[PDB]
Symmetry: C3
Subunit: 411 residues, 3 copies
């Protein structure tokens, strides 16, 4: 009855097997039969993910904003935060650059309803800026106001830390309770994802089964385009910024990897920043980092790491937009990505944050997920998310070890 | 300062109100009652239908955390298995007595000068997908019934899994969130007590109008409901509790001789928690182990489904039959099993029978703002006090039957 | 980092100048398209907090006043505040009648004057105070229902804290502690917003002065006068009378409080002035076990100061729109605003926040160009009025604690 079977294998088996099942049911098969019977199982998966998108974004940004918040943040924490901000700055640039070098999306011009999707643009800059301030925070949270909820979660989280710097213990315990309850909710939402990723093998099967059956055979190359663009910018991040930052701080990059070798390979196969944390701290000890440093910097890196997701969103955004037929400019690209990345603080791992934040960025840009085109194109990245999330978490851990080595050397 | 037995108040208001209404019905003014008396009854209906969302949610989070494995102990597993198999019979008896007696037929209400037409029904695909809340906050916000149930269970379960974590940051966080969701649930119960203080006035006004407008046939139809519940009530005790006692080698005759006052307390207090002291004392009289009845009786006061199962069985059939819609056995158990599975943690809880009915009406599509649905619900809302007496009595009887069976299988 | 109160006053005085000269031969429209959006950002930032502070504050507030959780020394000071607000409401309205703010400026900005839509049957308006769904109420800005639910929740929480079950009693203690802190976080967020206030307040009156003419500055002076004369009239006619009736010399009482009031008049913070207040309570010779309990409560549950604010503010904002307001409706609106403002005494800018709450509850949409413009006027001079508002608050807390200590 039970499959206590490796969760990552399940999803990869479902993807590889599902594309086959769908593709042969595509050639001489019945694209429609797949759509009416197989697809609803995929739709159930998409709903289950798009469910958590609001609680995790909110509750995670409250805790996240509380972590980075001054002056609650210590002097050893300030320098590693500055580290992550300047690594994500390059990661965003690489994300877009690889999404420009490779061209995912073009080639497949989807118009599923017998009509191509038309994005409706755009309130005046006056009206779009005013609207980031939620007229009613509860209502914002209630009916999926994306940007307002971000704004409120940050301004709330920061305010909570200022209460924890108060002489009144009535006040200071109150904030400690509220933050503790907002956390745990965030934490419960992560555990719920783990459970949903258990349905992922069945759901991911059903998703690409339909897409392969209906969108032709061109899709598998376009998804390979995405995988390539991410994975080459993945290693380009390690080589061009992590290795440079190690070398510029007088740490040998070659012998650094020799320690992290299994710690990265664990992250590449576990996808969990928290699950790999024990392996990470042990390797930080191997390299000879101080106990009072890696016990504080590594739990933060497992949450406030933006650079990994920055490479995911860079390519994913461009693909999902290009596929719909809308040509996206470099200006809009970084506007969307910096939004997604700045909203993904505290959400580093988190099993499938890459695909979740993509939903959040779709609703905020106007594209309704109920629309047949937007739904179909999202279902493609949702298929190969497992693949991309492997490398996403691998670079995360690599950048946490690169950060902790640079921050320990300066101590 | 009306410092007077709350149950008497409501019964006085019901008996007196039906008289006042009925004579104001014969040669009186049905309309004057409707314009002046009825608004006081409407205030009562609002006050109840207010709590329906917080108690269902917060109660199901705590409820799901109680039954949740593997947080549940081995002595708790066996009593949970007990309650599942007693509710299975209670649901069957509930429907069976609602079929034997025929409440609802005879009074074909069409108050607006038009009979109510229930609008059915999205495809099974669309109705199943929709149990997953697209946005949990929104679900909670605008009265998504089934989605809120789904989310409350999946949240409550996830919270217990966090309490089995080595990280005390994680484990305290979940302990705080659950403690805050509880207490909210608990506060909602206390608010009901306060509302039941208005119940005598409100219940007066409700049946006063119904009797004045719906004729004299109503009192027999409500007697039909009371009979159907109370004969299935004793049929539960005789056919399943006594059989379960006898099959476990406990004498049913001498068992009742101990519980005699513990049941009669529950029949007059309506409170599973208020009767708990009387219950535990009687469990000691029968000679149950201290480490058993101190754990099994607080659970029975919350996760007891069998009592409500008899309430909802008859209430659903009446409220549907009265509206003119003929209900099948399939739909009956679909509705009841939904109501009962959503009523875990809500055993007492002063007026849960009438509250869960509101929840089941909104979930089935019938708007409570509709004049027919409102009138027919106001009928069961009138005689709820009567039915809730027996409802809580069977609850306590089944808790003592459970604890005796579970203690005998221990030592 | 610069003194926050100065900033706002500088922005107001400087902004009215900038706007007014840009009004005469300048460009009222250019101000509206470029300057005003910065003021609108300020109005949004305030109207943001209005729902969480009202709710969370009323839960904690209702838990404080709640019987029988309230002690016997607390019962008598609560009775004190109820009977001081009773007079403060009366004075608020009376000074709003004596002075006539609003009339003279008949604003019809859209080329049309605002028409308030009245009013469901008393049956339907009373039934609707009970929220059909508390979450929904909270979600989409049901004002009166949220008040109702916050009170009935807060009271219920105290009754759980009087329970033998420690599972039950800790649960309520946790929930209340988490609702507090949210309330407390909302106050800290206001402080941050008041840091933008100087820029935002500049932009608001800059537009109003530029577009509504020069008549506005006299009408705002009308509001300031009406508040400040009823402010001192409160101290003289009720605080001094209550001190004298309890055998305390009012003349020599002020001689001690002289700097404690002047601190509150310049700090605007009931909590920031609390150290100065307790020191003066010691100077007057109040018992340690009294002013350490009564003064922190007064810094929060003081309603009398805000009752004078809403009395004048409501009348002005309504009169300016062209709607003539009766004495019946006046006290209906004010008693609503004041009964919803318990726990919210300070709280940096509660006077302006509660005004938004009372505007949405009466039907006037803040998105409407007229309602928005008239609210932007009181929002401009709020800093001024909030100075005296907090000053009377602290004075009434010292008057209360002296009367309650003398009876102990
Ligand atoms: Hg989504
Ligand atoms: Hg309801
Ligand atoms: Hg507002």
């Amino acid at each position: 009855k039970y499959i206590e079977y490796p969760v990552l294998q399940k999803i990869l088996i479902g993807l590889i097997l599902g594309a086959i099942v769908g593709l042969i049911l595509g050639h001489y098969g019945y694209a429609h039969a797949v759509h009416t019977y197989v697809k609803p199982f995929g739709d159930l998966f998409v709903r289950l993910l798009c469910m958590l998108v609001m609680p995790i974004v909110f509750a995670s940004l409250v805790v996240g904003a509380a972590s980075i918040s001054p002056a609650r943040l210590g002097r050893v924490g300030v320098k590693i935060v500055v580290y992550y901000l300047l690594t994500s700055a390059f990661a965003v640039t690489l994300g877009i650059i690889m999404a420009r070098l490779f061209n995912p999306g073009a080639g497949i011009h989807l118009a599923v309803g017998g009509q191509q999707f038309q994005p409706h643009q755009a309130p005046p800059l006056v009206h779009i800026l005013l609207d980031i301030v939620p007229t009613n925070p509860f209502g914002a949270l209630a009916n999926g106001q994306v940007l307002p909820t971000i704004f409120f979660a940050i301004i709330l989280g920061i305010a909570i830390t200022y209460l924890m710097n108060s002489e009144n213990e009535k006040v200071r315990k109150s904030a400690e309770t509220l933050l503790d309850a907002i956390n745990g909710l965030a934490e419960a939402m992560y555990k719920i994802v783990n459970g949903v990723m258990q349905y992922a093998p069945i759901g991911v099967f059903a998703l690409i089964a339909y897409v392969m059956a209906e969108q032709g055979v061109h899709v598998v190359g376009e998804l390979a385009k995405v995988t390539a663009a991410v994975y080459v910018g993945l290693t380009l991040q390690i080589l061009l910024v992590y290795f440079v930052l190690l070398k510029i701080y007088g740490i040998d990059p070659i012998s650094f990897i020799k320690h992290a070798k299994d710690a990265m390979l664990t992250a590449f196969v576990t996808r969990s920043s928290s699950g790999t944390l024990p392996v990470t701290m042990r390797v930080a000890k191997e390299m000879g980092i101080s106990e009072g440093i890696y016990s504080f910097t590594l739990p933060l890196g497992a949450t406030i790491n933006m650079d990994g997701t920055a490479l995911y969103q860079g390519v994913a955004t461009f693909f999902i937009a290009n596929a719909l037929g809308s040509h996206l400019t470099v200006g809009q690209q970084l506007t969307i990505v910096l939004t997604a990345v700045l909203a993904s603080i505290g959400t580093a791992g988190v099993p499938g944050a890459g695909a979740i934040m993509l939903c959040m960025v779709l609703h905020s840009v106007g594209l309704p997920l109920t629309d047949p085109n937007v739904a179909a194109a999202y279902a493609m990245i949702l298929g190969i998310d497992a693949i991309l999330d492997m490398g996403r978490t691998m670079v995360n851990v690599t950048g946490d070890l690169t950060g902790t080595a640079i921050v320990a050397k300066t101590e």
